[PDB]
């Protein structure tokens with residue numbers, strides 16, 4: 001097969017979708033074939049559609065999902081309020097495994113964080129990563145609390161030997177500010193910061209977004225992913 | 227010794243300090259000798275002082291600090307910004323051991339999450355809790371993101387065999403919305419929810435705060451904290 005990365009956020013409203021779009025855009029510009037998988041979408045009631053955002057921002061067409069829930073909640077809580085169960089473990093693992101192919105970067109975007117239930121019974125994004133032998137790309141803030149959340153996530157990854165492919169600051173403020181400036185340095189000490197995406201990037205059109213994305217990541221790391 | 231609890235938060239501004247004051251007040255009202263300890267205080271140049279707020283809200287006078295840093299950052303960055311060192315491990319540990327004594331509840335409030343560096347080198351609040359055989363009370367929100375943050379915290383606690391004393395929802399809205407109610411239900415399935423403190427508790431006066439605190443916790447749990 002090719003390369004499967006899970007993309008997981010240390011919190012909500014952290015830029016995980018725009019990070020998926022930006023890495024997909026950068027990988028496409030390096031001539032890599034890209035698929036993005038959002039097995040469970042939540043928050044549809046307020047208009048959430050992460051696959052469509054990835055489509056609009058990065059031009060990916062291989063966009064696969066299994067379930068969509070109205071409530072802005074973690075999947076198990078959204079499925080419980082909907083009265084309809086989450087997808088099965090086999091459904092999620094097989095979709096990703098069938099998406100995966102040589103020459104392709106497949107991004108699996110989580111919902112609700114690394115350790116919450118994503119598929120029944122009690123299977124998490126971490127479990128999925130083990131099952132498909134994906135490394136995990138961790139999307140973080142530069143704001144107070146990030147260091148704890150990041151160290152915690154990295155421990156959780158190590159605890160099941162899921163490789164960490166690095167950090168992405170999903171939104172970098174302008175001007176940085178005192179805390180954000182210190183955290184960017186501190187985060188670089190515990191893991192590789194692959195990019196810091198400028199605040200406001202989700203509002204860009206496709207050409208500007210691809211411009212931002214090509215410059216946001218190390219070109220050699222992107223090309224080395226596959 | 228007595229009972230030592232480290233009080234830690236799943237994130238920033240989840241209500242760690244109000245929970246410390248609320249538990250201190252309920253315990254005092256059950257006749258328990260209470261001390262509150264904040265070994266690392268950051269943000270003092272902005273007026274942050276969690277010990278002072280605890281005394282204000284709950285009337286506790288047995289308050290113990292140690293390190294104070296001006297900038298409102300994580301302890302390691304706040305120390306560096308001021309050209310200062312973090313405390314040593316035994317400086318935090320001795321501070322707690324000196325407070326600890328039979329019949330006493332000693333609450334140790336963290337600074338910026340369970341795994342943030344508290345003492346040099348690389349000593350965290352989890353390491354301190356191991357050294358003093360304290361359990362951890364985990365302060366959380368009812369907002370989206372809490373379930374992951376809480377499960378990460380519990381897993382890190384269990385990785386070093388630090389007992390979880392339960393959860394406290396530091397700010398609970400009135401009325402609770404759908405998301406808040408669903409999250410509290412899910413939180414109670416992963417651990418004991420000891421309390422959910424009403425929003426705006428910091429603006430209560432001494433008498434209202436004490437009454438909130440006595441109603442917020444299970445009487446039998448608070449009384450059983452110290453033998």
Ligand SMILES: Nc1ccn([C@@H]2O[C@H](CO)[C@@H](O)C2(F)F)c(=O)n1
Pocket residue numbers: 012013014015016018170171172197198199200201202203
């Ligand atoms: N670099 C970034 C990161 C995030 N965002 C936007 O912030 C909201 C919260 O994640 C996202 O929903 C958002 F995507 F709209 C952004 O505009 N640019």
Ligand SMILES: Nc1ccn([C@@H]2O[C@H](CO)[C@@H](O)C2(F)F)c(=O)n1
Pocket residue numbers: 239240241242244396397398423424425426427428429
């Ligand atoms: N139950 C609660 C919880 C929190 N607060 C106030 O919110 C800020 C961050 O929790 C605290 O600083 C605050 F204390 F001001 C509150 O008033 N009542």
